[PDB]
Amino acid sequence: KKAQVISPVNGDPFVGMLETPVTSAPIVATYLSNLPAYRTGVAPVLRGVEIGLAHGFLLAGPFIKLGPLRNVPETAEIAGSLSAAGLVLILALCLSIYGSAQFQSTPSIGVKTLSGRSVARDPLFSADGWSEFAAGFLVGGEAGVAWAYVCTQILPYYS
Amino acid sequence: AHIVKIYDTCIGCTQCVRACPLDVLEMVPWDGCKASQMASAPRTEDCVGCKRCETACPTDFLSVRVYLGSESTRSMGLSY
Amino acid sequence: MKDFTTYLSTAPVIATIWFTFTAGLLIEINRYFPDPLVFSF
Amino acid sequence: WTVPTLNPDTPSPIFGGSTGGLLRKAQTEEFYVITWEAKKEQIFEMPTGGAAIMRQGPNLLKFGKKEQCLALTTQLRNKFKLTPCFYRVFPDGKVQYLHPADGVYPEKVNAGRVGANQNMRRIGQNVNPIKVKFSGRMMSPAE
Amino acid sequence: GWVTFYWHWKHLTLWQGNVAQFDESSTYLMGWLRDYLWLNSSQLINGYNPFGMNSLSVWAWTFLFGHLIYATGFMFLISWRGYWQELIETLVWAHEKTPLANLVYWKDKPVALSIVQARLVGLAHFSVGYIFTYAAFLIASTSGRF
Amino acid sequence: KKVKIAVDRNPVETSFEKWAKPGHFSRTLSKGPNTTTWIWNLHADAHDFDSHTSDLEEISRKVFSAHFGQLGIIFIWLSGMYFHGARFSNYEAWLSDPTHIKPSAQVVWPIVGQEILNGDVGGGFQGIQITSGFFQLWRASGITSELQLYTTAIGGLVMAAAMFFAGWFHYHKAAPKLEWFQNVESMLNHHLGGLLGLGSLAWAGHQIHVSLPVNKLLDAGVDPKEIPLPHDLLLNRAIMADLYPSFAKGIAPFFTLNWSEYSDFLTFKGGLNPVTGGLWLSDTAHHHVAIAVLFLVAGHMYRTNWGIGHSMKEILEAHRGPFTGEGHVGLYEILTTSWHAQLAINLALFGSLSIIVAHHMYAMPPYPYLATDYGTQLSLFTHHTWIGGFCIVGAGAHAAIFMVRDYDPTNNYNNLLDRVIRHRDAIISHLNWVCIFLGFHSFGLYIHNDTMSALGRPQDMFSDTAIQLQPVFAQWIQNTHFLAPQLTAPNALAATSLTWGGDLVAVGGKVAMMPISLGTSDFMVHHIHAFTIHVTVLILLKGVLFARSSRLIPDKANLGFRFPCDGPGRGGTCQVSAWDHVFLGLFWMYNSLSIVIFHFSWKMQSDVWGTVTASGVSHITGGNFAQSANTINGWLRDFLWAQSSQVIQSYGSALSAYGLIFLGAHFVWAFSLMFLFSGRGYWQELIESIVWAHNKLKVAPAIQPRALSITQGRAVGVAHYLLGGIATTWSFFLARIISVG
Amino acid sequence: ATKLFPKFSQGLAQDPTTRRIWYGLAMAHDFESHDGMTEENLYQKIFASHFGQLSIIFLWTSGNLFHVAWQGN
Numbered sequence A: 001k002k003a004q005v006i007s008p009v010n011g012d013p014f015v016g017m018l019e020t021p022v023t024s025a026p027i028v029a030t031y032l033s034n035l036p037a038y039r040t041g042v043a044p045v046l047r048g049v050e051i052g053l054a055h056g057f058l059l060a061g062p063f064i065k066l067g068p069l070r071n072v073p074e075t076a077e078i079a080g081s082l083s084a085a086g087l088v089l090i091l092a093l094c095l096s097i098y099g100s101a102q103f104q105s106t107p108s109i110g111v112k113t114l115s116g117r118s119v120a121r122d123p124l125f126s127a128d129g130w131s132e133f134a135a136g137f138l139v140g141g142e143a144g145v146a147w148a149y150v151c152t153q154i155l156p157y158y159s
Numbered sequence B: 001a002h003i004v005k006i007y008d009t010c011i012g013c014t015q016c017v018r019a020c021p022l023d024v025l026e027m028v029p030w031d032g033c034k035a036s037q038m039a040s041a042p043r044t045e046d047c048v049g050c051k052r053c054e055t056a057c058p059t060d061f062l063s064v065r066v067y068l069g070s071e072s073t074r075s076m077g078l079s080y
Numbered sequence C: 001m002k003d004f005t006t007y008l009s010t011a012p013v014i015a016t017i018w019f020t021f022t023a024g025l026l027i028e029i030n031r032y033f034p035d036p037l038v039f040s041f
Numbered sequence D: 001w002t003v004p005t006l007n008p009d010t011p012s013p014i015f016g017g018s019t020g021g022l023l024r025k026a027q028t029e030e031f032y033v034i035t036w037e038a039k040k041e042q043i044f045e046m047p048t049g050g051a052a053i054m055r056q057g058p059n060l061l062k063f064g065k066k067e068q069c070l071a072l073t074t075q076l077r078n079k080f081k082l083t084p085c086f087y088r089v090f091p092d093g094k095v096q097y098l099h100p101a102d103g104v105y106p107e108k109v110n111a112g113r114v115g116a117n118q119n120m121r122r123i124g125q126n127v128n129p130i131k132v133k134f135s136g137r138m139m140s141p142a143e
Numbered sequence E: 001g002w003v004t005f006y007w008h009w010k011h012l013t014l015w016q017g018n019v020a021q022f023d024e025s026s027t028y029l030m031g032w033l034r035d036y037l038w039l040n041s042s043q044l045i046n047g048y049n050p051f052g053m054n055s056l057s058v059w060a061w062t063f064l065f066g067h068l069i070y071a072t073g074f075m076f077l078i079s080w081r082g083y084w085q086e087l088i089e090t091l092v093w094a095h096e097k098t099p100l101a102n103l104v105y106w107k108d109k110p111v112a113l114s115i116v117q118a119r120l121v122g123l124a125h126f127s128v129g130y131i132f133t134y135a136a137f138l139i140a141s142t143s144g145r146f
Numbered sequence F: 001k002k003v004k005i006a007v008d009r010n011p012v013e014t015s016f017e018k019w020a021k022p023g024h025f026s027r028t029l030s031k032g033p034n035t036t037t038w039i040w041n042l043h044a045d046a047h048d049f050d051s052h053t054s055d056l057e058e059i060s061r062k063v064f065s066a067h068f069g070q071l072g073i074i075f076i077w078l079s080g081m082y083f084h085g086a087r088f089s090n091y092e093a094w095l096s097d098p099t100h101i102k103p104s105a106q107v108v109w110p111i112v113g114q115e116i117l118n119g120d121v122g123g124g125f126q127g128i129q130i131t132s133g134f135f136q137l138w139r140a141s142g143i144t145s146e147l148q149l150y151t152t153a154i155g156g157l158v159m160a161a162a163m164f165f166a167g168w169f170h171y172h173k174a175a176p177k178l179e180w181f182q183n184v185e186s187m188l189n190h191h192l193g194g195l196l197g198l199g200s201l202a203w204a205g206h207q208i209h210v211s212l213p214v215n216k217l218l219d220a221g222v223d224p225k226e227i228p229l230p231h232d233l234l235l236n237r238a239i240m241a242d243l244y245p246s247f248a249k250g251i252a253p254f255f256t257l258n259w260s261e262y263s264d265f266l267t268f269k270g271g272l273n274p275v276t277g278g279l280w281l282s283d284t285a286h287h288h289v290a291i292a293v294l295f296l297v298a299g300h301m302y303r304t305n306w307g308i309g310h311s312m313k314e315i316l317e318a319h320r321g322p323f324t325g326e327g328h329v330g331l332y333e334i335l336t337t338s339w340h341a342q343l344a345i346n347l348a349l350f351g352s353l354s355i356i357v358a359h360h361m362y363a364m365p366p367y368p369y370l371a372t373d374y375g376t377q378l379s380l381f382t383h384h385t386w387i388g389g390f391c392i393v394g395a396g397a398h399a400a401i402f403m404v405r406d407y408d409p410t411n412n413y414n415n416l417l418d419r420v421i422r423h424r425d426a427i428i429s430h431l432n433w434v435c436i437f438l439g440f441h442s443f444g445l446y447i448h449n450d451t452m453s454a455l456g457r458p459q460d461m462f463s464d465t466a467i468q469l470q471p472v473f474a475q476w477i478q479n480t481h482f483l484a485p486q487l488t489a490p491n492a493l494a495a496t497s498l499t500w501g502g503d504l505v506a507v508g509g510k511v512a513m514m515p516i517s518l519g520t521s522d523f524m525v526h527h528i529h530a531f532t533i534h535v536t537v538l539i540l541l542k543g544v545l546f547a548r549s550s551r552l553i554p555d556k557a558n559l560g561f562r563f564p565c566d567g568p569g570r571g572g573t574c575q576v577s578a579w580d581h582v583f584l585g586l587f588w589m590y591n592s593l594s595i596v597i598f599h600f601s602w603k604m605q606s607d608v609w610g611t612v613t614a615s616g617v618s619h620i621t622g623g624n625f626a627q628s629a630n631t632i633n634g635w636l637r638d639f640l641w642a643q644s645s646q647v648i649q650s651y652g653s654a655l656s657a658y659g660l661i662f663l664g665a666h667f668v669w670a671f672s673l674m675f676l677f678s679g680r681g682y683w684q685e686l687i688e689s690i691v692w693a694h695n696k697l698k699v700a701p702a703i704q705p706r707a708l709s710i711t712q713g714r715a716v717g718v719a720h721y722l723l724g725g726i727a728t729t730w731s732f733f734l735a736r737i738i739s740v741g
Numbered sequence G: 001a002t003k004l005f006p007k008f009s010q011g012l013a014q015d016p017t018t019r020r021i022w023y024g025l026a027m028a029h030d031f032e033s034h035d036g037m038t039e040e041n042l043y044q045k046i047f048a049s050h051f052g053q054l055s056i057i058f059l060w061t062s063g064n065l066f067h068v069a070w071q072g073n
């Protein structure tokens, strides 16, 4: 009756996260580590660009296919792309003011990597890093909304 | 922080200190012009404001009084 | 049966008996003198 | 008696982990460490939820709240008759001895602790709020 | 509410030339419920239906709005702080342990509304719903006929 | 041997001296009252037997004898129903014409003008049209007489006397020891094989010999006085053979395994009797035989005194995995040492069972002329749904009581309970998230539709016309069960219910049951149901898992299961108790089941119930659930406001009591809000200002007037809330459906 | 740590929770409970707030008039 799966976090039973397959499966850990959010050495502007492209491309679909002009043939895609552009703009604003509100106290404790080696803090989690991250998010999100429209126009099997 | 005052009707029953879940109160000797002991509140920066102390005070009216003041991380009992 | 009559003298039992009595008196008064809107008799 | 320094090489009870333990507060502002010496390996209840086995000898435990530490203290004193003492630990590494500040527990007297916040009047002898009005900060007549 | 119910029903029966309705139905509360609240709600609640809408649509919507605000105030009036602080602690844990979202963190620590604030917010939702519900009903039952 | 009868002889003196001493069971109440809080605590603590003593033996004895008392009371109630059907009924008239005569078994005395409630129900009778279904149940049992109901009432009174004697006996004379109660293996063996196996077998026998022939003759137009009495069918095998030829062969086909010979009275027809609109009693008899065999083999599963069988402790201690640590180790001790754990599990499953009963009795009407008595059907569904919800909230309550009182961390190390308490934060966080997600994507759909309909945009609604949210999984399951007799249940002649699909069964011109079509409105309301259920679960499970400790209060178990708060500190800890989680789960169970029964009422009145005037079905409301249940304004207008015209216009009718109780339940509900919205500190000060006036006139009582405790304030509030709301719905439903159905 | 918004209360500005925002919203016009409040400054702030209420009232009436004139019949 050996081989229990669920373990305390980094073996610490008093921190309270309970490492688990959904948390620390190597496929899951790999996928989440490869996401631009957790690429702590890469410049925050470029991670923001990638995140924004993804999100602007994805959140145009709902506005296109479910918006108020979804039943107008050529106007549905334009209206949805513009709604998504507006939402991306609002989100960039929210990101900017979050960077203004959050990064003022400069935490002093260091970080480790569940292995023992201390790493530097993510430059994303600074005022300048988050400002450039939000700039990248805006650029990438508007670019991804435009690309969502372009895909509405050029993809063969778009309904 | 919360204001925890202790008045001169204290009989030194120690029940307020027994019932405090934050170790805010203690029993000091001969500050009250009384029998042996009188209650004290030297750690009111740890007081959450539960009023378990003045639930356990038998005097009428209460010899221990908690006046809810400004809130902090300790007064609001936050593990986060 | 001193204890039984002490039980019957309890607040809920005495209340039940007294209100059964009052309600029965009112019910019999309203059966034999039906619809008393005003004091005219 | 003098203030004991927290020995960090103290082992911890056998606990399989929970989700009620430390949060970012421990990393940011402060957390709490409680130490006690057990005579035998006994199962106790964690204030975070769950059952842990305290080890024979000294046991160290981390918590993110003082009320958790004193709840475990009262459990160990009332169900096991132990004598725990806990500290306040900051991410700086500064340790502040807290619970038996005098060495004895506060329900008993130690002859040398100074009384604080003792009003030498009756509770019905407080002044009216119209006397403490415009005191700078908003105040109660008990001051 | 009693005052304005009385006023509105007396004057609705006066304006309709049917004072006998009030004089015969205001002596019992099923007349108030049937001949004032239920009878005058017909045009109001038909402001929008599966067969279209009219200008009373806004008052129907506002009716339901006030009901909703009122009932939400019930949440702050019956349910008290201590359930919500523990719920919020669980949510705090969830946010601190969720990947891609622990990147975002609060600056003000989430706590449940205080007891006094709970009472204030519940009373405010209660009163706003009361007021909006009765204003919608009053305008829609008076503007629907006149 | 280990499984044996073990009792103490004369443990408790039968004496009235403790009747005369209220609060004897408590050490805190035996000191007599000084305040009225004592008067309330004497009733709150009367049945908290684990707070009277702490040894499990006396607790279990009290529980056993109190169960005997409950059974005696249920028997009094059943005998009363049978007696009111024998004396104050139109049952013999209803048998001869069940499609026109309204069942009534309560006559009102003509005292204060209330003889108007004695309505013209039919059969030359004046009384209250009952909604209990007792007439249909009696016709299914094959009663056909008031004398049989009278003798059933007398038997019920005899059995009630027996139950009360048994309680007195098993507490005062020969009370079982603790080791007798902890024989859970033998208890389960006997309750499966004997209580449910022999019980179902005996009812199957009654149905073979009494119900089936009597109802086959009743369905053949035979007047109940021309029908042979049940004992003539028991004695004369020729009569039964004339009705069911397999009786000519005797019980030989049973012992020769030629069971197909019994296909005359043991059928698998499925569907409904077209004469009565109820289930085929031959199918029902076969059902009871089958489950009797099933439970009798199930009751031979556990090891009691011989080597064969299972030790439930072994099963539990063997069921563990890589994810669950020690697994079910320590649960046998929990469930053999804590009564509250057993009560939690049992109330949970009993309430789920009551709700399942509600859902299964409307779709497969088991009684004759029950499906077309729309009032009986609606009332039964509503009733059993409510009983189930209450039982489930009580399951939450008593799980929390176990966690506070009877939980021991020594017996639970790394087992399922320890590991559930150890990740309660994740459980409750994900439950909170799913509750919020469901609330949004269920109720915000209704808000979106209300906004669109008000804005003049019906093409933007989530309707069956504009944006279809079709419940395709439920529709597929419907189609699969409809086509079951063709592929996957070929020995069944028809589907279990007509709700899956097919044609309607019309009895007396009225629809007994007809296919229920699921659409966008059904999607939305089922997700509303899921939402409300998940929130009730959230509240109750949060009270259970956070009963002992929290991140707010780590020593909550020492404060108890039932405490108002810890204080105004930590920002305020009001309702951190598990009792208060039950208190809130009650509100949410009410809000859930109100929508459940509203959905049922409207769906039935719109898409099932109605009349067949020409060839074509005219439903009660007209089929408006599909297009009007998309919005909150539709539920308000087309269900609440429309269907209230029968309860508010009932004055001067036999339904006037329903309007009166409508108004009074509204009153009680609103009166609950004085206790829910308020707090004890205002009322104690008001009470002392009143006590001043009583002291001035020398009428100040010695039992000092106190305000109700915080916990009692909340309890009174929720009790009055539930009573008012449920009785309002009760009056509305019954006044509506007695008129329109 | 110490925030800036409840300028009238240092105890609320030092509150690390969301209670700070709410209580600074709901203690703004309880001028007597303000930190460093003199009775004279109290009366003067009341006078100014009264001028502001009057300005708001007259603006609201101006808007009613303006909209009845512009969009009304």
Ligand code: CLA
Pocket (backbone or CB within 6 Å): C026, C029, C030, C034, C035, C036, C037, C038, F112, F113
């Ligand atoms: C506070 C409000 C209120 C008031 C003022 C009334 C008043 C009345 N109601 Mg209404 N009622 C109320 C609330 C109220 N009710 C409520 C809440 C309900 C719903 C539960 C009802 C439901 C209701 C019904 C259904 C009926 C009434 C009736 C009546 C009448 C009763 C006449 C009667 O019984 O004569 C009784 C006459 C007496 C003289 C009795 C007085 C008491 C004693 C006996 C006098 C003492 C004599 C002597 C000294 C005793 C010696 C000692 C003794 C032990 C021997 C009266 C007009 C009845 C009626 O006809 O109305 C028109 C009727 O049918 N009411």
Ligand code: CLA
Pocket (backbone or CB within 6 Å): F012, F013, F014, F015, F016, F018, F019, F024, F025, F061, F062, F063, F065, F066, F068, F069, F073, F164, F165, F166, F167, F168, F171, F172
């Ligand atoms: C006349 C016969 C008799 C006598 C003298 C006693 C005497 C005693 N019993 Mg025993 N008992 C009896 C019959 C009797 N019992 C029966 C028939 C049962 C089976 C139910 C029991 C079951 C029993 C248990 C389980 C317990 C006792 C206990 C006691 C002691 C005090 C009980 C008390 O305070 O009574 C006063 C109590 C009542 C009058 C309440 C009666 C409630 C009845 C059963 C239910 C009625 C419900 C009612 C219909 C609800 C209506 C609601 C309303 C709104 C309409 C005492 C030694 C207790 C003890 O501690 O003993 C040491 C104890 O725990 N007895």
Ligand code: CLA
Pocket (backbone or CB within 6 Å): F063, F064, F067, F068, F071, F180, F181, F183, F184, F186, F187, F190, F191, F193, F194, F195
């Ligand atoms: C075949 C045997 C058998 C049967 C039929 C039952 C039946 C029942 N038991 Mg169980 N029980 C059994 C064996 C059995 N038990 C054994 C062996 C033990 C010891 C481990 C227990 C221990 C036990 C406890 C601890 C409790 C029960 C309870 C119950 C009742 C639950 C309520 C219910 O379903 O109402 C259905 C009601 C009926 C079917 C009405 C008929 C009732 C008949 C007359 C009694 C059943 C026969 C009886 C067990 C045998 C003795 C007969 C007597 C004349 C000496 C139910 C009557 C609970 C209860 O309510 O207690 C009163 C309860 O708390 N039983």
Ligand code: CLA
Pocket (backbone or CB within 6 Å): F201, F202, F203, F204, F205, F206, F208, F209, F233, F234, F235, F236, F237, F240, F246, F247, F248, F249, F250, F251, F254, F262, F289
């Ligand atoms: C518990 C359920 C139950 C009961 C009680 C009965 C009972 C009966 N069935 Mg039914 N039956 C049932 C279930 C049941 N059945 C089911 C589930 C099926 C489907 C398979 C059937 C199918 C069926 C058929 C097809 C037939 C019956 C028949 C019968 C009768 C004949 C009994 C017989 O020959 O068996 C033998 C039984 C015994 C020998 C037991 C008798 C023991 C006595 C009581 C001993 C007492 C003696 C005492 C100690 C001393 C005297 C006391 C005093 C005077 C001193 C009998 C009335 C037959 C009949 O004639 O029906 C009208 C028939 O043809 N049954």
Ligand code: CLA
Pocket (backbone or CB within 6 Å): F043, F044, F045, F046, F047, F048, F049, F343, F347, F390, F391, F392, F393, F394, F395, F397, F398, F401, F561, F562, F579, F582, F583, F719, F723
């Ligand atoms: C099998 C069913 C069952 C059983 C055996 C128990 C048994 C128990 N429960 Mg549990 N409970 C149940 C179902 C059950 N409950 C359900 C369904 C709920 C949800 C409502 C609860 C909720 C619950 C809570 C929240 C608590 C208990 C408690 C208790 C204990 C003491 C109860 C007491 O003394 O009340 C004695 C009886 C009363 C006080 C009477 C209550 C009357 C109600 C409120 C009014 C309803 C009456 C009627 C239907 C309305 C019309 C009346 C008319 C006159 C107007 C006892 C162990 C308590 C406990 O263990 O404390 C530590 C406790 O705190 N239970």
Ligand code: CLA
Pocket (backbone or CB within 6 Å): E068, E071, E072, E073, E074, E075, E078, E079, E083, E087, F431, F432, F433, F435, F436, F437, F438, F439, F440, F443, F444, F447, F535, F538, F539, F584, F585, F587, F588
């Ligand atoms: C109508 C009254 C009402 C409403 C709306 C709510 C709403 C809620 N309750 Mg409360 N509650 C109420 C009455 C109400 N309650 C009452 C009377 C009680 C009895 C005391 C309770 C007791 C109670 C408990 C005990 C619990 C809740 C929980 C919940 C939440 C679950 C649903 C959810 O999050 O879905 C999403 C939100 C909704 C469905 C609310 C309506 C929102 C719609 C979709 C409109 C969205 C607006 C949109 C964003 C536009 C914004 C406009 C902008 C200008 C601001 C939610 C916050 C549970 C909780 O918080 O955990 C999840 C919980 O545990 N409630």
Ligand SMILES: CC1=C(/C=C/C(C)=C/C=C/C(C)=C/C=C/C=C(C)/C=C/C=C(C)/C=C/C2=C(C)CCCC2(C)C)C(C)(C)CCC1
Pocket (backbone or CB within 6 Å): F078, F151, F152, F153, F154, F155, F156, F157, F159, F198, F199, F201, F202
């Ligand atoms: C309704 C009611 C009533 C009545 C009831 C009744 C009347 C019942 C009955 C019951 C009965 C009347 C029962 C019976 C039973 C029987 C049985 C249960 C049997 C069994 C058998 C068996 C099981 C068998 C086995 C076997 C075989 C098969 C062969 C040979 C061998 C042997 C023996 C082994 C009263 C009054 C109470 C009131 C309430 C309600």
Ligand SMILES: CC1=C(C/C=C(\C)CCC[C@H](C)CCC[C@H](C)CCCC(C)C)C(=O)c2ccccc2C1=O
Pocket (backbone or CB within 6 Å): F674, F675, F676, F678, F679, F680, F683, F684, F706, F707, F708, F709, F710, F712, F713, F714
């Ligand atoms: C109204 C109310 C009260 C006051 C209610 C009182 C104290 C209870 C009244 C119950 C009855 C009326 C008193 C019983 C007196 C006798 C038993 C009755 C016998 C004689 C009658 C004929 C008068 C509270 O104490 C309270 C406490 C906490 C939260 C909310 C509330 C709350 O809303």
Ligand code: SF4
Pocket (backbone or CB within 6 Å): B006, B009, B010, B011, B012, B013, B014, B015, B016, B017, B038, B039, B053, B056, B057, B058, B059, B063, B064
């Ligand atoms: S303050 Fe009250 S409880 Fe504490 S010691 Fe003094 S008298 Fe006792």
